[PDB]
Amino acid sequence: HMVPMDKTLKEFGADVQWDDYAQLFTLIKDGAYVKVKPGAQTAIVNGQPLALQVPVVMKDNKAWVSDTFINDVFQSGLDQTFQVEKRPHPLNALTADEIKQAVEIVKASADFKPNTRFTEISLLPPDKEAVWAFALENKPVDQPRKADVIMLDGKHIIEAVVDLQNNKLLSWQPIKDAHGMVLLDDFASVQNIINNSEEFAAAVKKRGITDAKKVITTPLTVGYFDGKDGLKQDARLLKVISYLDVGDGNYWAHPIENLVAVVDLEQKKIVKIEEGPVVPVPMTARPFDGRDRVAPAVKPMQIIEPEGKNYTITGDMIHWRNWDFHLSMNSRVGPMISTVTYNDNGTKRKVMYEGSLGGMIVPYGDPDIGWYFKAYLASGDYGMGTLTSPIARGKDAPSNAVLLNETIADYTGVPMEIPRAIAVFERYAGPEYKHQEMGQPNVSTERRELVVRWISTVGNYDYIFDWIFHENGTIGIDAGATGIEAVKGVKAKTMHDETAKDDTRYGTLIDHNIVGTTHQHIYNFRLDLDVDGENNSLVAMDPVVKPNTAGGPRTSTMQVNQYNIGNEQDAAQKFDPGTIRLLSNPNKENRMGNPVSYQIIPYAGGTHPVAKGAQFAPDEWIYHRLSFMDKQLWVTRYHPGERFPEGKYPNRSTHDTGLGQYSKDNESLDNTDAVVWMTTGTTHVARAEEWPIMPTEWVHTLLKPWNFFDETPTLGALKKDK
Amino acid sequence: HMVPMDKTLKEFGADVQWDDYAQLFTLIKDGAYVKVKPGAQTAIVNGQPLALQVPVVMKDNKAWVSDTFINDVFQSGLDQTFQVEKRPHPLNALTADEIKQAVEIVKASADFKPNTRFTEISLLPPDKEAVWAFALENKPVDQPRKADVIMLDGKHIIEAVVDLQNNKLLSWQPIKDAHGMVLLDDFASVQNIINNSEEFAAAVKKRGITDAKKVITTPLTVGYFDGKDGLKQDARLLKVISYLDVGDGNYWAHPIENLVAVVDLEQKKIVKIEEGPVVPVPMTARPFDGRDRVAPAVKPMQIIEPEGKNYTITGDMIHWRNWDFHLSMNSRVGPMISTVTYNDNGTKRKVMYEGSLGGMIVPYGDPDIGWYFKAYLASGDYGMGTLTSPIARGKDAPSNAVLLNETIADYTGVPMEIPRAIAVFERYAGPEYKHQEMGQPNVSTERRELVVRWISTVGNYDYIFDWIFHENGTIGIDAGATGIEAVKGVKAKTMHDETAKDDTRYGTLIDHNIVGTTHQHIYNFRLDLDVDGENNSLVAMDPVVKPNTAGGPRTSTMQVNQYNIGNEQDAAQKFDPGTIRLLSNPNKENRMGNPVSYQIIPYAGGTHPVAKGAQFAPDEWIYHRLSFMDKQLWVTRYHPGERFPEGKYPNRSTHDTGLGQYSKDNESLDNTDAVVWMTTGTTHVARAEEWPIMPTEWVHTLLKPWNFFDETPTLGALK
Ligand SMILES: [Ca+2]
Ligand SMILES: [Ca+2]
Ligand SMILES: [Ca+2]
Ligand SMILES: [Ca+2]
Ligand SMILES: [Cu+2]
Ligand SMILES: [Cu+2]
């Protein structure tokens, strides 16, 4: 017996195209490009013939396929995109089995308390040296796979380490004064607590809300203010901001301004309510899903690769052109790109041991009650990998992308598969190079880039990260932001209203009674680059104008001031785009005797105003806790446990336990294992074009080979000589 | 009777694909996407059925089609990408007949001298108000077609104006002291003059060059150094840099350093030979055309639009989603994007009256003899539109692009049609917007951008310009640079050699004996934005940190310092990317009471280091002549004859006749017709990855609607 083709393929996620003139179906799914004609005893998969026992059957205009069609075709082997890993890469993320195993081990421990939650269950980093030896020399890692198990027992954090090979607990260590990140049940608890609070219901009522059951809460971390916010440093608290649900699918457009509840999560109660002036909730329906819009007409546009892809995915390793890298997922920071090498005429040269988002923050500038403590440290406090937003095929990623599924542990320690977690796609990116010599045949070649895209949504705002590998050796890192703006309820409807000026002192009036409060988007990428080896140095090249001392008519020249940056403190700096900053290997040179290096460009542009620093006075607590927000470039000595710019436990942190801490000892950066950190930010002043939903805005960063190679990297394989 | 399909189609410039499984041919050419089966009585053109008089026939495994095929299919009318223009827009460029006509009118004047050349023959446009009334109200411009005809009689410039309808000469004016741009015959004269110079051949011989017939010249303008360069101001001169042809198709890689010849184009002779230290010519073959290489096989990738394009081209008017604009070509600056409007829910609102490259310069920073006066003013001294480089289909532009031919007049006044002069193409640009609310169905829409791309090549370096229209109202303007770097021959083979440090004082050693001399790439775009109307004002919004005075724990807040920039001198400024600069219409506001505006971002990023200014001391002659290089934003009052940041006659200019002159008067910019100028540049410190050919490097600029609309512009019309 058989099934209906359209509905089944659609559910399966394939794109189905029917050409009535050619009597042909074109089916596409990830790396598979399939052609199949009704009645045919053969189908084509990536340009190769595939025998079909049961042909596609056309019945009264409906196509029907065998119940084994999806598998026979899409899992045939003619789609070579994915290959089986023979020898397991040491950096492969914990499998669902290993995650269950780690949880069983801690659950077996004597000190384990029922009720414990798991903030993070991830692979404990194997030693770097052995990992590269595995990647370059194929040498097995003889160290047992271990897992870091970070638990929250009520409000207490405990870090444990389990030996997976040997099935045993290695360490169990309580971490004094650390606060755990926000976990998913905290969202439900805050909503329930608020719903059962008699006093909150009364506060809401006086603010014009008739049906308290329509109140939507949103949990926010409270930060640290040395008690000026009046909050006990020892309680596990969350502040709660509320909106009214009016049924337009966008509660964010209906702020209940000046009403903040402080919830103690262990006690499950509201311990404080801050109330300021009553501002009538903006009630106009402002849907962003199109329910009230006309679906316009657009003709089809598809990017296709009929013979399959130029990249191969073996287990989690991706091979493409001269690039080789390992891609895995972490629950806190998302994708981890590792053991990145560039095959230079047969020799695989190291480029980056490990790269990933370090951490990020979206801090606000309004002093009002519902905003003063507002700051979203998205990855650290909320778990961006866990909150990954599955790619909407063909929209969040081009139609020629391949979408990968990724597995991580949820907060109860149960494996969770995130579908379409990361997109991989090659794309045309203009001419790689061109030279039209006058009177001669033109010379042009196309540029191809391989993009690794991941999206994560925390609350109202959606973040996109693209790791772009250019065939010429350059690596771009771009971050996109879209989503729904956090807005403030105001009485002005237009700038002609009496309260207009005061209502927009901290943000633009983007709609009647709604202000898009000013804030910054600050991203930080942690890049353990290893330029052609472990031992490198940080070098500065500042282009400058100097007096001409060579004679002739010119009064000046363009020269360069080159100097090494010897320690961490001098490497923590602002980045002037007019200058060049290189991570060089002083032990290896290119053909002209220049040290092989990579140019670090923390600021390659953006579509929103750029942040030059943190938009906070130096006496602000957020300023003192997060030093990473005020400098664009940081370079620190490699250490396996220094991975976050904001610190490992930033919820209610009292001091910098991140980049401020990692560079405080001011270690030497001369001919040593360096880790580059790039902070890139935006200062977002809003406008009406961004409401009810904000068009994606992007920021760009770049890493370019500098004298790493001896000539134009894409010219091609040399036809003559050795 | 029949003709071979592959052969006929390929000659036509269409792509031919055969699918043996579906027994289907897929034929593509610009906006035509055709499908045809051998023996079928019909074909499909952009999704619509077409009856064929003669079915394609498979003879000897080769397909054959009627001799009328191409016309019947590609010109059937089913490909609606191009539409007839029954009422020519007033900014349409001079047609081939008009250029022939303008030349005949100036040649009929008794003042016309034998051998006169034409540096520029272009439309002298109607007044702006009448052009806008044609675009928005279909009102005919009742002014006859006119052309500006700029002539070069030997070295003398004369500006003439001709009335094409009436067929008469309206004016003829010699331009005192102006030097004409470099014309194509000047390239051949320089090389010939060098070839016939006994003294030059002896200097070359001295420098190791065995065969002087292998010497390639390159003509360069000499600038102005108030006589310090020893050159007469009245003479028509060019400096000549030389290279050796070794047979690798890349003379640029074999500099003959420290040898410079000054040629007087009227006397037709070398008038000065400058000789510096002898440096053996870098001889190693360094081809960039692939003759010595084999590319890695790549699986096919195609971007298809089977039902045709979302844009329509009527004459030169392009319509795409909510945008409408006119695209035309100019021999000096290339493409002109005009009468740009945004259709906001059924009403066309003004955005930009005219936008185009203003001018550009690539100045060097070495003081030596063959470099100190080096500065290519690409469009103004060599004419970038004339030097347009035909788009290489599928490589210089994506495979789903439509390539337009454009016509201009050559230096002899003869119409010249440039094939594939401009690329037009739509491209997926990530999600337009997205919101995945926890536990709810996702919301994502794709972003589409329409790109207008043009490439021009002047000497060794290739310039790419992309005018990008975003569906949401933003306009991007990107500039890419590629080609062969100008290199200095040096003795050092590696940084371990004795002269290595001095040889690299002004540039990186990128190959043995070769240094890529440091220089800047500075582009300036002239943008006559008319934000929702002619009358606008320049407003600054500087985000600042201010002490909190509202109470609560915070010591500071994020606020904005807003203020108007009232006159041209204050508008001439550095651009801090952390600030906001708006061109606002103080007469119109959006739904919230905010003035409709466009946010100007002269610096939105780049892949090479960014130039913060001119890397020249303020007393350099190039600095003085071209003030546009040191400020990223300029706003001046609209004036029809102010179109070049470097001035109209920049060859050997003695002072700033461009933006320094246009803003000199420091006029008021309050509620008046403004023209924005964006200067964006790079400081290029070279690397080995850029030799022998440089991977394209880009810079980005942006114009974004700011309270121009009342909500997300891409949500759609309300049901
Ligand atoms: Ca490192
Ligand atoms: Ca350290
Ligand atoms: Ca204007
Ligand atoms: Ca003026
Ligand atoms: Cu924002
Ligand atoms: Cu350059």
UniProtKB/Swiss-Prot annotation, chain B:
Subcellular locations according to the entry: Periplasm
Swiss-Prot/TrEMBL keywords: Calcium, Copper, Manganese, Metal-binding, Oxidoreductase, Periplasm, Signal, TPQ
Cofactor binding annotation: Binds 1 copper ion per subunit. Can also use zinc ion as cofactor. Binds 2 calcium ions per subunit.
One Pfam family hit: Cu_amine_oxidN3
Keyword Zinc: no
Description of activity control: Inhibited by 2-hydrazinopyridine.
Binding residues for Mn(2+): 528, 530, 673
Origin organism lineage: Bacteria, Pseudomonadati, Pseudomonadota, Gammaproteobacteria, Enterobacterales
Binding-site residues for Cu cation, renumbered to this chain: 519, 521, 684
Primary subcellular site in the record, as a coarse category: periplasm
Subunit architecture: Homodimer.
PTM-bearing positions, type 2',4',5'-topaquinone: 461
Start and end residues of each stretch annotated as Disordered: 645-666
Gene it is expressed from: tynA
EC number: 1.4.3.21
The protein's name in its UniProt record: Primary amine oxidase
Active site (UniProt): 378, 461
Biological processes per GO annotation: amine metabolic process; L-phenylalanine catabolic process; phenylethylamine catabolic process
InterPro entries, A to Z: Cu_Am_Ox_Cu-bd, Cu_Am_ox_TPQ-bd, Cu_amine_oxidase, Cu_amine_oxidase-like_N, Cu_amine_oxidase_C, Cu_amine_oxidase_C_sf, Cu_amine_oxidase_N-reg, Cu_amine_oxidase_N2
Keyword Oxidoreductase: yes
Molecular function as annotated in GO: calcium ion binding; copper ion binding; primary methylamine oxidase activity; quinone binding
Residues where substrate binds: 376-387, 458-463
UniProt enzyme class: oxidoreductase
Binding site for Ca(2+) 2: 568, 662, 665, 667, 674
Pathway: Amino-acid degradation; L-phenylalanine degradation; phenylacetate from L-phenylalanine: step 2/3
Assigned protein family: Belongs to the copper/topaquinone oxidase family.
Protein role: The enzyme prefers aromatic over aliphatic amines.
